[PDB]
Amino acid sequence: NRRPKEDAFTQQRLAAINPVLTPRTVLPLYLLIAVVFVIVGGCILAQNSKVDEVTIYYQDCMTNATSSWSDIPSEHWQFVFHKYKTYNTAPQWRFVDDESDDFTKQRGTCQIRFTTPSDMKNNVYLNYVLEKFAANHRRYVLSFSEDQIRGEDASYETVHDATGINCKPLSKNADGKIYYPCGLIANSMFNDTFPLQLTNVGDTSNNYSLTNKGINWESDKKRYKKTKYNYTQIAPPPYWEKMYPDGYNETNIPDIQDWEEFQNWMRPGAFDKITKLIRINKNDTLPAGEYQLDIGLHWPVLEFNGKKGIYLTHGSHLGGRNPFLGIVYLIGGCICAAMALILLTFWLFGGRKIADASSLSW
Amino acid sequence: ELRTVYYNMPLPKDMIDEEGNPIMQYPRNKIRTTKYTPLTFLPKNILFQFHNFANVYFLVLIILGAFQIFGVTNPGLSAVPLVVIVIITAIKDAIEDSRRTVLDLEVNNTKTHILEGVENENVSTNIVDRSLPPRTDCKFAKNYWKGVKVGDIVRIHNNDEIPADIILLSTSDTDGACYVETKNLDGETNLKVRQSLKCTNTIRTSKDIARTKFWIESEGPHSNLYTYQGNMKWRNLADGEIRNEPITINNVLLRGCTLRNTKWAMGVVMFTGGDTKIMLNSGITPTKKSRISRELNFSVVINFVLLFILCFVSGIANGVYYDKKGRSRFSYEFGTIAGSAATNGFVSFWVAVILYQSLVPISLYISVEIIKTAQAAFIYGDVLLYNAKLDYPCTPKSWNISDDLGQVEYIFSDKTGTLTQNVMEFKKCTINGVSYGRAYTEALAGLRKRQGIDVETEGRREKAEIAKDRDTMIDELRALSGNSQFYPEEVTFVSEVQQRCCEHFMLALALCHSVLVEANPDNPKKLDLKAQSPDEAALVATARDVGFSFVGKTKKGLIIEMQGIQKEFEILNILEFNSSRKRMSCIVKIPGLNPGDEPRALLICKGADSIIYSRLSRQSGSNSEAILEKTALHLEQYATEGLRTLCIAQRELSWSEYEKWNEKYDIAAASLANREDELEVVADSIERELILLGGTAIEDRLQDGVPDCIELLAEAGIKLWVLTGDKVETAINIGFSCNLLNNEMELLVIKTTGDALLSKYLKEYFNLTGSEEEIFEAKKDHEFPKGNYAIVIDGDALKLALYGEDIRRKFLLLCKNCRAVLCCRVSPSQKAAVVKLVKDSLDVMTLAIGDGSNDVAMIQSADVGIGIAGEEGRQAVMCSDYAIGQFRYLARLVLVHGRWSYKRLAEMIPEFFYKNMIFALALFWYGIYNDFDGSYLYEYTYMMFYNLAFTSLPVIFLGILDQDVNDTISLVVPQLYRVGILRKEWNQRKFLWYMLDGLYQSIICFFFPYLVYHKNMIVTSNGLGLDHRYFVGVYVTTIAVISCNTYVLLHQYRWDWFSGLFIALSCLVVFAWTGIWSSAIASREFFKAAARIYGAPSFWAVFFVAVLFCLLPRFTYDSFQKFFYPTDVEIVREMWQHGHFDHYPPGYDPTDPNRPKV
């Protein structure tokens, strides 16, 4: 016979819950989600308020900082210390000129003396912050060679004519030696020479050491690989010509596997603020002290009125000080209780039988 | 166009066409019934898919992939999603259409008999002559129905369908008469006498017809079933004179008809293929886009308007960025030309169209195509729509309109064979004012007061059937009927003048008829009744069962086995039944009691009650006037039960006054006064004073669940309009037995009598309906109408009530106000025209169920079209969208599957556009932060896999498997069907609120991850950096997929394990994909996203607060809806939770007669 197969799937008789949203099931569900999210919101804000951060903008250090120590204008620095809420002891900055640097747009050394009144714990992250540097335009974020990130001695057509991601405005120079970290992302790599320590101002042989190791993920060394170009095949990018004044020698070619500041730069920031790790110390903790950052100024930001800064923090597990997750778990927790309140009171002062509001039998 | 069929004769000089001599090029005798002939399958189907507006859009995205200005990576591979979707939709529409071709190939291979004589209408790539030798190899060979041609002699044997339009040459019956079951072409339950032409009546064998030369000068194909004009012309033999015999519609076998009660019927094939009247009423099977599917384009257009707004926002906001001054792109990007940009946001408008192109999603039409195919696959696969008696499941033949079945407001049912079972049963009679017959036909009108504990009277009548069969068990040699006896009256006893009347009533039923007797081949001692009307087949079979077996016929008269012993009755005259007579008389010769005297005679009149009660005797002394009140009281009782009534009347005539009548009958007979009505008026003189024997009642048997189904369709708010090709009082009998017509009703007959007649009582019944014409007010009202008015229109008055715009409007308005609408004697064109009247002038969903070819226009014209399957191969089954085996399966098809398929897709399509724009709008909201420059938030595999793998199946397993209530509760509560009649579940209003909820939740989907990055861009526990835009797009995607699928889950009634698993795996493939892909070096910027982002606790902290904020404003509104303004199905589910429906069995079927008691 023809007789379709009867097996509770083809008969559309699968086992099923058929959920009916009575106020006996939904109003305690709101209160339960309201209870968790004021607790998760209370415990996120509590841990977030302990996140101490030092943000010092130094884009104006060639201009507004003298050769002497002057307090930075309060426009530039933001200090958050939860043990010291009314903390206003301003950081200092001075500018050593370096007339041999011959660049004059961003040269010299911005020495920055901040005073953290509370110690940061074991991981101490020195981040540089870039504001208004737009690393998220569509030509910018596609401009590199993935062959050359992967350590390949890639030809001209694989760095320039690669279909998604190519080094398109910056493939090769005038004499045809291709740029080894080609593309706009590698070219515009944030120079500024950050030190390998914080100099403890007012203490001898207790300089808080920093390191450029442990700066990217360890796993990017699977993707970032040592290059296979001869030194005859490659040139530095055009804005790296001051780092390598003579092109690439037999020994000066940067192994981008070890060079993590490149690897952090080559991850373009999603948004208009850009925070990239440049110096970490995973070994020791940073005491309550007055410390000094000598930044070799090489990265111009003022011609686009952008900011350029230092972000010295020990984050939380949620990363950084940001009140959003704590506030908005509270808001969603206070909203689920407010609407457990509105719907319960409307169910008492209205409310109906669960059997006959049907339009047919009126 | 006048065509001239030549037979056995070369064509005249009008054959100038070479490479094939005949010019007129007749159609092959094939039924097409398929949506696409394969020469234009692929052109028509691509246009059908590109009548959808989003497909036009996707094709434009591909054409604008070829420009390098847009910068699209591998534009040619971007056409692969549209190309496979157009092909997978075309293959599904080819397999759908090929299932129609296998029924075209069955009908075209149905093996008629075609004469093997050479036919001069072939393509390249004294009428019988006795002097010609009877050559070999002219036999009527079994050739194919597809191989029938115009000009082809076809011997149609007994009991097979007629392959084309055939003008009879001969039948096996002498005097060349034929019989045809025209319930395919009409709703006529009777057989039609077709006459062979008197010229060709003497043709008998294939040797005779091969030596016969003629031609037929005929009129063209003209679609009117009750008209034919042709002129058969043939050369006289041994005399050069051309003779003429006119051909009309009682000399034509039309293609729906089946040859009945005749051994063979030889005829010339006149029209073939699409020329046949059966097919001029049909059209090509329309492609039939669903109403939700048609209004999806205005939903698609709103998304284009939103798409145009956002690309316009991004086009102007980017072109404003490029002529800013202090921007880092001057130094670090090499856009070192400050000039060359005045307003070049025109490129960034069009970059944004590619950036936001998934705001109108490629997986839309292929989602709804998978939905509708699988909704067709589940209708085919359930067994409560399976007819075991035919071995036939419900066959969805249009695989895209299951949701049309959920909004249906007007069912334009046929009656005969659709409502009826084509069985006529003698259920009741009256003899001498005494009601006989126990039938439980329509005592179930009373479901208002008394119970369904009356399964007992089915058993009570059944014991009375057996007790009657034991009581009537006298040895009657041809009353083999123990099973074909359908008159249970235990009062066959002798309480007598009543017993003498009960013997003589059934004697008149065995005498007065035109029923023949043929020997059955299986049990040749049992002989079965070959009747024209199955009324009389039921009358003679019930006389056969109660003793008075009509067993044979002689040249003298009839032989009636009268209670075991045979008696010859000498029939003096038969006054034949006629359409205008509405009666039939029979004169028998009463034998002699005194020797040497020629004895008397007995007229017996049978016919309609109202015109036999006119012709009764008033000059009496006996009880001839005493019983007229009782028999009329019962024939009123019988018709309210929906039974065909009749009356038997007699007058015992004297031997000479009959002989004066029989002489005056022979005056009109021997003269050429047959066309004159004197032969009727001579019959009128003897039928004036009649003694009323009593009446009969015949159940025109409905199909099994017909009055229960129509009650469920009326409780659903659907209004059944019966549209029939047969008579008015026939469809009133079916109307009462169906509970359509309801004795308290005022039946509003239109009844033209002869042209503004019709409008005045259209206006007159429009004062008891206190309204004139206003139909814009009417299409606001979708309630089932209240006043007990039934409208009955003759078909011929409906030709005038559908002529112009003004009378169509008041005729529509009255029919909309009447509870029962019966359009009788309606041609196939006007049944379709009534649907096209209602479907256009009101904005309503129309059904039109029917079996037969007179319904095929109606079925093709409506929004669904249902065929009712039978033993034969039916055009209404082939030409339809669904095909059920019984009528009562319509309640399971409309109230369960349609009402599901409506609500499944009405929720799915807003859920789908919600689903897409919760993701595609973060490509917009990231534009605020990249200056609308056009960089992608999302890694490229996420953009492929969002609508393909991450969220595709939960919407798909809502559109296929969601049930608001059970399949039983869909039938217990038919009023849940009213939200689709009121069109409540699919609105552009509901759609705009899903867009506004999709707008909102994508603000949550982007900005909740933006607001964890925005402050200091460190979101990782170890500070190492997740600030790639693709990593932020893992945050956004994962909120998007989980708050898509749980939104789809929370709007799914009936959380089953199959959908809830594939919602969970959907939710877990977005974690599984980026775990797998972002462990490979080919991820290429994305390389360890899942190790880094899923190991970052900020991801898990954004994830649960943003899924809250996405789902909560809709989940609040639903909780505020379902507590305070609940829909009816939200309350019926609450009762189902409480167990108002758990005493019903699984698969409860209210139209099933063999259902358990609840």
Ligand SMILES: CCCCCCCCCCCCCCCCCC(=O)O[C@H](COC(=O)CCCCCCCCCCCCCCC)COP(=O)(O)OCC[N+](C)(C)C
């Ligand atoms: C580019 C060239 C590609 C060539 C083809 C590639 C592969 C295509 C897919 C494989 C072929 C699938 C064929 C499915 C046929 C289903 C037909 C069916 O269910 O019948 C239907 C009944 O089912 C229905 O009406 C419900 C709707 C059909 C549900 C299944 C549809 C499957 C085909 C459409 C989707 C295909 C998509 C393919 C994409 C690659 C007709 O009834 P019937 O009385 O004619 O059936 C008689 C059956 N026999 C003959 C056994 C008595």
Ligand SMILES: CCCCCCCCCCCCCCCCCC(=O)O[C@H](COC(=O)CCCCCCCCCCCCCCC)COP(=O)(O)OCC[N+](C)(C)C
């Ligand atoms: C949680 C568990 C999930 C498990 C995985 C499920 C995988 C299988 C899913 C079955 C198919 C269900 C969905 C119907 C087909 C959708 C096809 C489709 O449109 O896929 C596209 C992508 O398509 C491709 O990449 C290649 C083409 C694949 C086409 C697949 C057709 C499948 C037909 C299946 C027929 C039988 C189905 C049976 C019942 C479910 C979605 O595109 P988008 O809108 O996401 O892309 C936007 C990106 N830009 C902006 C650049 C354009």
Ligand SMILES: *[C@@H]1O[C@H](CO)[C@@H](O[C@@H]2O[C@H](CO)[C@@H](O[C@@H]3O[C@H](CO)[C@@H](O)[C@H](O)[C@@H]3O)[C@H](O)[C@H]2NC(C)=O)[C@H](O)[C@H]1NC(C)=O
């Ligand atoms: C890292 O350091 C370099 C130098 O300290 C930064 O400046 C870039 O330096 C190059 C060459 O030193 C400049 O190119 C020169 O431009 C002048 C005038 O524009 C032209 O006449 C010369 O022929 C040469 O092409 C370039 O202007 C300058 N770039 C900027 C934005 O100032 C570099 O920017 C630093 N930052 C990186 C690599 O991100």
Ligand code: BEF
């Ligand atoms: F005999 Be039908 F057209 F239901």
Ligand SMILES: [Mg+2]
């Ligand atoms: Mg009919």
